């Protein structure tokens, strides 16, 4: 079995196809604490041991450590999150081959050439042995590494003439990376990674406007508000009450406005692209501004409505 | 301004393109009561007058009258729902040309030929004058009518050879229609409409499980549960607790299995199709079963992740 994994610092996305020809997409959060969970009842808990350290999946983990999540890519927790993702995917415990991802500025050096040291370091990380109390864990065999962004725009790129170039904008949970690639992957024109902004900006704004606990527990509430930000009817029924709908809609627009300014400002660093694609979980939050501020016809502007999965799907369509 | 309108009996979907080339999609529910609403405060209420009768948008309308929603297509409420959709779309009040829809078995007679009487009846319906208290209403000028299903599969159909044929499966709120159309619209092979089943089957089940009020006010809760039916973490935070997650998950699965059996049984009435497409709001609820029980390669199986909008988008790509 081969599993494609876009192990982001917010959510791990998985995609694979089963014998009955069904293609499955799974998503599992990166929310673990460095200690085992205690269950005196039947509630299932996942306690792991990796590199001698203890870890457990935590549904209410503090949104703390809003610092360097780049190092997370080579961390123990990353290994745990991926294994946990495999365990809750539905697939049967077994040996598996995987293809994981490395952010653009980690996969490539400043010369836009493969950073072999980082790629190997990523493969080595998944060799760290893991254990699960009261259960079996999958066995990761072969590890392949693909860079982010490019796999998502691969389909479109096969269609582009060598002279054309696709601009890929990826808004993630805590990062906003933009790259430009010549048609048929004739070369990488430019890469601009930014780990100072992400969707969490709006999520954090929402958690503030409603004064919600700064943990994973309230992440779903925040996301539902952002996702349905344009449907008052939904908000009316969702927001506790007191109709803070005014303040939250006010907080969201602030953050969204900031995401747009950043993207537009960075966009000014690129030129000559003939096609544009917006991917990542935050795609819907900036697609309008991007399309408005680019000179590209509808025919050449790409965006799906399953944006958080665009990358892992692209990886799949290539390596499966 | 030209507006494409898929006025379904559950939700009115709109799609149009503005000056800055921005393409917008809007959704507005069909939840009205035959009586004005009384507001003693600042809360805005929409009270309409059509054909004399009084109507008003109702956020907590009873899910009553689950009888004939086909006649709804030519009703006064439909006219009100469309006008209400226009008013909450974000577009400026004005004159507008529109393209609306008619279910497959209404647009076509049993000989699969345009039912001109029904088509004209649909156009005439929007000529009924409407009024809004405390505001102006849009003015519907030219009315065009497209059948359901086919516009959604039009893109793919242009690519198919005249000999191939696309099977379009549309699962809506209260209807399940299936059609088979020859490549390049070289002819309609078969139409099978079924107004006995719809997504409301699962929504009703969910409401029963959580014993929620049988009104629109609880429809959002029900839909979030169904949409996130595979994410325990979300369900854990969404469900009012008590972990009825077992009972609701049990209710949903049974309703879903019923939807699947119906679709599979009807599918047995079709043959010779070379491509398959699933659309409508319920697409995600039956896509797997359908792909599993069809002999079609992945390349020839179509499904977007914005299913409720597939039709209106198809209408837009053809008429705009
Ligand atoms: N508004 C909105 N948010 C979405 C949508 N899909 C996913 N999200 C959310 O957007 C955030 C970003 O998701 P994603 O890009 O997958 O995160 P990541 O890849 O883990 N981030 P990073 O690349 O920085 O490591 C998540 O909190 C996710 O739940 C959507 O359609 N709309
Ligand atoms: N599970 C699920 N439900 C969805 C999704 N998108 C929309 N829905 C819901 O599915 C139901 C059906 O939507 P839709 O097909 O547009 O309704 P309709 O077109 O008005 N129905 P009808 O054709 O019978 O007149 C609605 O209650 C809608 O909210 C989705 O991705 N997943
Ligand atoms: Mg990412
Ligand atoms: Mg990764
Ligand atoms: Mg419909
Ligand atoms: Mg209609």
Q: What is the DSSP string of B51-92?
A: TTEEEEE-TT-B----S--SGGGGSHHHHHHHHHHHHTSSPP
Residues A148 and A219 in one domain: no
Pocket of ligand 1, candidates A308, A309, A311: which has the most ligand atoms within 8 Å of its Cβ, to mutate? A308
Resolution in A: 2.2
Which structural technique was applied?
A: X-ray
Residues A123 and A76 in one domain: yes
Q: Which residues contact B122 (CB under 8 A, 6 or more apart)?
A: B73, B74, B100, B102, B106, B143, B145
Domain span at residue B246? 164-303
Q: Which residues contact A143 (CB under 8 A, 6 or more apart)?
A: A97, A98, A99, A100, A122, A123, A126, A127
Residues A280 and A308 in one domain: no
The shortest CB-CB distance from B220 to any of A216, A237, A306 is to A237
Q: Which residue of A has its CA nearest to B293?
A: A20
Closest atom of ligand 2 to CA, residue B198: 24
A21 with B220: Cβ contact below 8 A: no
Residues B96 and B57 in one domain: yes
How far is the C-alpha of A160 from the C-alpha of A181, rounded, in Å?
A: 10
Tell me the β-bridge partners of B12: B7, B28
Q: Hey, what are A11's tokens?
A: 């959510």
First-residue to last-residue Cα distance in chain B: 10
DSSP letters, A215-280, are BGGGHHHHHHHHHTTT-HHHHHHHS-STTTHHHHHHHHHHHHHHHHHHHHHHHTT----SEEEEES
Residue B94 exposed, middle or buried by CB count within 10 Å (0-12, 13-18, 19+): exposed
Residues A253 and A314 in one domain: no
How far is the C-alpha of A124 from the C-alpha of A265, rounded, in Å?
A: 37
Contact A24, A18 (CB under 8 A): yes
Q: Which residues lie with the beta carbon below 6 Å from any ligand 1 atom?
A: A 8-11, 172-175, 198-199, 223, 226-227, 280-282, 284-285, 307-308
A20 with B224: Cβ contact below 8 A: no
Contact A171, A199 (CB under 8 A): yes
Residues A26 and A158 in one domain: yes
Residues A141 and A174 in one domain: no
Q: Which residue has the tokens 């192990």?
A: A7
Integer angstrom CA distances of residue B157 from A215, B167, B215, B292, B302 = 48, 10, 39, 22, 11
Query: How far is the centre of ligand 4, averaged over its atoms, from the C-alpha of A249 (Å)?
Result: 32
How far is the C-alpha of A297 from the C-alpha of B11, rounded, in Å?
A: 30
Residues A207 and A297 in one domain: yes
- Using a CB-CB cut-off of 8 Å, the residues of chain B touching A221 are 237
CATH (domain of A268): 3.30.420.40
B27 with A231: Cβ contact below 8 A: yes
For residue A18, the tally of other CB atoms under 10 A from its CB is 12
Q: Which residue of B has its CA nearest to A218?
A: B237
Q: Which residue of A has its CA nearest to B290?
A: A22
The distance of A288 to chain B (nearest Cα, Å) reads 7
Q: Report the number of distinct structural domains present in chain A.
A: 2
Residue B308 per-residue DSSP state? G
Residues B2 and B88 in one domain: yes
Pocket of ligand 2, candidates B11, B26, B203, B284: which has the most ligand atoms within 8 Å of its Cβ, to mutate? B11
DSSP letters, A100-157, are EEE-HHHHB-TTSSB-HHHHHHHHHHTTS-EEETTB---EEEEEEEEESSTTTTHHHH
Residues A27 and A170 in one domain: no
Residues A172 and A270 in one domain: yes
Closest atom of ligand 1 to CA, residue A9: 25
- Using a CB-CB cut-off of 8 Å, the residues of chain A touching B22 are 288, 291-292
Residues B11 and B106 in one domain: yes
The distance of B296 to chain A (nearest Cα, Å) reads 10
Q: Which residue has the tokens 């969970």?
A: A37
CA angle A222, A227, A232 (to 5 degrees): 95
Question: In terms of Cα–Cα distance, which of A95, A201, A191, A188 is closest to A141?
Answer: A95
């Amino acid at each position: 079995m081969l599993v494609f994994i876009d192990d982001g610092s917010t959510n791990i996305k998985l995609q694979w196809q089963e014998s009955d020809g069904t293609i499955k997409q799974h998503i599992s959060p990166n929310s673990f604490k460095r200690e085992w969970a205690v269950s005196f009842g039947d509630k299932k808990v996942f306690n792991y041991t990796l590199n001698g350290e203890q870890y457990s999946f935590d549904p209410i983990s503090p949104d703390a450590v809003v610092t360097t999540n780049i190092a997370w890519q080579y961390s123990d927790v990353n290994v745990v999150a991926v294994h946990h993702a495999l365990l809750t995917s539905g697939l049967p415990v077994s040996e598996v081959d995987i293809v994981c991802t490395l952010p653009l500025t980690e996969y490539y050096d400043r010369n836009n050439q493969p950073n072999t040291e980082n790629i190997e370091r990523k493969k080595a990380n998944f060799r760290k042995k893991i254990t699960l109390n009261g259960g079996d864990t999958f066995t990761i065999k072969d590890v392949k590494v693909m860079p982010e962004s490019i796999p998502a725009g691969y389909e479109v790129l096969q269609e582009l003439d060598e002279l054309d170039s696709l601009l890929i904008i990826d808004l993630g949970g805590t990062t906003l990376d933009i790259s430009q690639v010549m048609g048929k992957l004739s070369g990488i024109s430019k890469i601009y990674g930014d780990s100072s902004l992400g969707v969490s900006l709006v999520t954090s704004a929402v958690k503030d406007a409603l004064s919600l606990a700064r943990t994973k527990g309230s992440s779903y509430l925040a996301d539902d508000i952002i996702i349905h930000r344009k449907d008052n009817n939904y908000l009316k029924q969702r927001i506790n009450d007191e109709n803070k709908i005014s303040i939250v809609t006010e907080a969201m627009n602030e953050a969204l406005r900031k995401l747009e300014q950043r993207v537009l400002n960075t966009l000014n660093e690129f030129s000559g692209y003939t096609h544009v694609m917006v991917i990542g979980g935050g795609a819907e939050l900036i697609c309008d501004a991007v399309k408005k501020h680019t000179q590209i016809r509808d025919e050449r502007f790409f965006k799906t409505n399953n944006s958080q999965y665009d990358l892992v799907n692209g990886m799949y369509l290539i390596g499966n």
